[PDB]
Enzyme design. Sequence first.
Site, PDB file in Angstrom:
ATOM      1  N   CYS A 108      -8.064  -1.505  -5.617  1.00 45.62           N
ATOM      2  CA  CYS A 108      -7.046  -1.747  -4.576  1.00 45.62           C
ATOM      3  C   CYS A 108      -7.899  -1.392  -3.355  1.00 45.62           C
ATOM      4  CB  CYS A 108      -5.766  -0.948  -4.767  1.00 45.62           C
ATOM      5  SG  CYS A 108      -6.047   0.773  -5.358  1.00 45.62           S
TER       6      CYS A 108
ATOM      7  N   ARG B  17      -2.451   2.218  -6.348  1.00 39.64           N
ATOM      8  CA  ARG B  17      -2.047   0.996  -6.985  1.00 39.64           C
ATOM      9  C   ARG B  17      -2.809   0.857  -8.288  1.00 39.64           C
ATOM     10  NH1 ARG B  17      -2.008  -2.737  -1.739  1.00 39.64           N
ATOM     11  NH2 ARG B  17      -3.740  -1.384  -1.153  1.00 39.64           N
ATOM     12  N   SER B  18      -4.125   0.981  -8.238  1.00 41.61           N
ATOM     13  CA  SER B  18      -4.934   0.870  -9.436  1.00 41.61           C
ATOM     14  C   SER B  18      -4.562   1.922 -10.468  1.00 41.61           C
ATOM     15  CB  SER B  18      -6.415   1.101  -9.050  1.00 41.61           C
ATOM     16  OG  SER B  18      -6.876   0.098  -8.212  1.00 41.61           O
TER      17      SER B  18
ATOM     18  N   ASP C  12       0.857  -1.166   0.000  1.00 36.07           N
ATOM     19  CA  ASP C  12       0.000   0.000   0.000  1.00 36.07           C
ATOM     20  C   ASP C  12       0.899   1.223   0.000  1.00 36.07           C
ATOM     21  OD1 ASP C  12      -2.663   1.553   1.785  1.00 36.07           O
ATOM     22  OD2 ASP C  12      -2.516   0.951  -0.316  1.00 36.07           O
TER      23      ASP C  12
ATOM     24  N   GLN D 159      -0.720   7.581  -6.197  1.00 35.19           N
ATOM     25  CA  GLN D 159      -0.625   8.244  -4.909  1.00 35.19           C
ATOM     26  C   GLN D 159       0.715   8.664  -4.411  1.00 35.19           C
ATOM     27  OE1 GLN D 159      -2.890   9.382  -2.282  1.00 35.19           O
ATOM     28  NE2 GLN D 159      -3.739   9.634  -4.314  1.00 35.19           N
TER      29      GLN D 159
HETATM   30  C1  LIG Z   1      -6.681  11.611  -2.336  1.00 38.62           C
HETATM   31  C2  LIG Z   1      -6.643  12.026  -0.864  1.00 38.62           C
HETATM   32  C3  LIG Z   1      -6.388  10.830   0.058  1.00 38.62           C
HETATM   33  C4  LIG Z   1      -4.993  10.868   0.738  1.00 38.62           C
HETATM   34  C5  LIG Z   1      -5.206  10.793   2.286  1.00 38.62           C
HETATM   35  N1  LIG Z   1      -6.160   9.744   2.528  1.00 38.62           N
HETATM   36  C6  LIG Z   1      -5.953   8.467   2.860  1.00 38.62           C
HETATM   37  O1  LIG Z   1      -4.858   7.861   3.057  1.00 38.62           O
HETATM   38  C7  LIG Z   1      -7.252   7.645   2.702  1.00 38.62           C
HETATM   39  C8  LIG Z   1      -7.576   7.310   1.269  1.00 38.62           C
HETATM   40  C9  LIG Z   1      -6.626   6.394   0.582  1.00 38.62           C
HETATM   41  C10 LIG Z   1      -6.006   6.753  -0.663  1.00 38.62           C
HETATM   42  C11 LIG Z   1      -5.132   5.833  -1.294  1.00 38.62           C
HETATM   43  C12 LIG Z   1      -4.856   4.548  -0.721  1.00 38.62           C
HETATM   44  O2  LIG Z   1      -4.007   3.753  -1.423  1.00 38.62           O
HETATM   45  C13 LIG Z   1      -2.606   3.801  -1.491  1.00 38.62           C
HETATM   46  C14 LIG Z   1      -2.189   2.860  -2.644  1.00 38.62           C
HETATM   47  O3  LIG Z   1      -2.922   2.122  -3.235  1.00 38.62           O
HETATM   48  O4  LIG Z   1      -0.911   3.020  -2.864  1.00 38.62           O
HETATM   49  C15 LIG Z   1      -5.487   4.186   0.557  1.00 38.62           C
HETATM   50  C16 LIG Z   1      -5.232   2.878   1.237  1.00 38.62           C
HETATM   51  O5  LIG Z   1      -5.052   1.845   0.676  1.00 38.62           O
HETATM   52  O6  LIG Z   1      -5.143   2.975   2.522  1.00 38.62           O
HETATM   53  C17 LIG Z   1      -6.342   5.124   1.154  1.00 38.62           C
HETATM   54  N2  LIG Z   1      -8.387   8.408   3.290  1.00 38.62           N
HETATM   55  C18 LIG Z   1      -8.349   8.607   4.630  1.00 38.62           C
HETATM   56  O7  LIG Z   1      -7.543   8.087   5.394  1.00 38.62           O
HETATM   57  C19 LIG Z   1      -9.505   9.340   5.279  1.00 38.62           C
HETATM   58  C20 LIG Z   1      -8.896  10.633   5.860  1.00 38.62           C
HETATM   59  C21 LIG Z   1     -10.082  11.440   6.377  1.00 38.62           C
HETATM   60  C22 LIG Z   1     -10.538  11.190   7.701  1.00 38.62           C
HETATM   61  C23 LIG Z   1     -11.659  11.976   8.166  1.00 38.62           C
HETATM   62  C24 LIG Z   1     -12.263  12.940   7.305  1.00 38.62           C
HETATM   63  C25 LIG Z   1     -11.807  13.160   5.978  1.00 38.62           C
HETATM   64  C26 LIG Z   1     -10.689  12.409   5.490  1.00 38.62           C
HETATM   65  N3  LIG Z   1     -10.016   8.461   6.360  1.00 38.62           N
HETATM   66  C27 LIG Z   1     -11.229   7.888   6.247  1.00 38.62           C
HETATM   67  O8  LIG Z   1     -11.943   8.126   5.239  1.00 38.62           O
HETATM   68  C28 LIG Z   1     -11.797   7.081   7.412  1.00 38.62           C
HETATM   69  C29 LIG Z   1     -13.194   6.488   7.108  1.00 38.62           C
HETATM   70  C30 LIG Z   1     -14.376   7.336   7.647  1.00 38.62           C
HETATM   71  O9  LIG Z   1     -14.376   8.019   8.656  1.00 38.62           O
HETATM   72  O10 LIG Z   1     -15.483   7.259   6.849  1.00 38.62           O
END
Ligand SMILES: CCCCCNC(=O)[C@H](Cc1ccc(OCC(=O)O)c(C(=O)O)c1)NC(=O)[C@H](Cc1ccccc1)NC(=O)CCC(=O)O
EC number: 3.1.3.48
Length: 297
Positions: A214, A220-221, A180, A261
């Site tokens: 992903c 990743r996707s 990830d 990402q």
């Molecule tokens: C484009 C902007 C996103 C960048 C920051 N966000 C994050 O890391 C993730 C989204 C994310 C993006 C790419 C990923 O793959 C990486 C890959 O494939 O290389 C993965 C993954 O695989 O983990 C996860 N969202 C949150 O964590 C939110 C942050 C947040 C929290 C509260 C309010 C607003 C945003 N939390 C959540 O959404 C928690 C769930 C909820 O409360 O509904």
Amino acid sequence: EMEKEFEQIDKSGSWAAIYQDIRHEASDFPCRVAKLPKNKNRNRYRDVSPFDHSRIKLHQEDNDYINASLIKMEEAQRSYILTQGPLPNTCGHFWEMVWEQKSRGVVMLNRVMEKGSLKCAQYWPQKEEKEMIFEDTNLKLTLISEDIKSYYTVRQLELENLTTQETREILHFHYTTWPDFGVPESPASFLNFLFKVRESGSLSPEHGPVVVHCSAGIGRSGTFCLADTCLLLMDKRKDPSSVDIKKVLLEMRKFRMGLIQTADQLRFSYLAVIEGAKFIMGDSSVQDQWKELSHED
Ligand SMILES: CCCCCNC(=O)[C@H](Cc1ccc(OCC(=O)O)c(C(=O)O)c1)NC(=O)[C@H](Cc1ccccc1)NC(=O)CCC(=O)O
């Protein structure tokens, strides 16, 4: 010239500023339906939504929302559906979409659990005698056979619409070693897998768009799609070196936000694409080298 650009970026230490620039220029389109309060339970992440203009609509009159986007590459002549890892209540929606879009292939690049954290529901059956029924969408899914490799597994699945009784073979390609926010172990491993996806027929234009996912459906996707799409371009330009990777990524970012990402995933797409061009150019033996180098066993 791709290679020439790649070296200049690498020698100038600029992967991060080139990457930040891409983010800065990407398209801003509304994601209104995804933000409606009633769809909060259909979204895995609060900051990752499909634009209104390219989202995939379920064919339910009830509630057509699925966090999924149709990435349509006009010049490459390829379409992809990128979606997050389904949740406990969207497993039926996910399969309803595969069915309604006529997808013949599903590409999964994450693991159900990563770093102890949960990234996706177990949406397909793990044992053939333990088939899955999606009551809400009137679908049945059965594991028919699977071929486990050291870093990926190809599964043969049978999806049946219980309403009309038609059955379909779905191939599922599962990359189990792509961390990830990370990059595949090597271009060879990546390419060996992509070429497996291409040789299965799944990506053919006589079928619906392949489904890529992903956990969020963007890092990743996005990576997998940008290399696949750049390679298709290099094979149809015949001046392959004029494919501009940043421009292809910005075109795809018009259909789904955040594709790719990290700067490192951007740099890997350049390595993957440059190594994959050896094949496009005419090297009849680089493919067997990737298989060997990928250590499939
Ligand atoms: C484009 C902007 C996103 C960048 C920051 N966000 C994050 O890391 C993730 C989204 C994310 C993006 C790419 C990923 O793959 C990486 C890959 O494939 O290389 C993965 C993954 O695989 O983990 C996860 N969202 C949150 O964590 C939110 C942050 C947040 C929290 C509260 C309010 C607003 C945003 N939390 C959540 O959404 C928690 C769930 C909820 O409360 O509904």
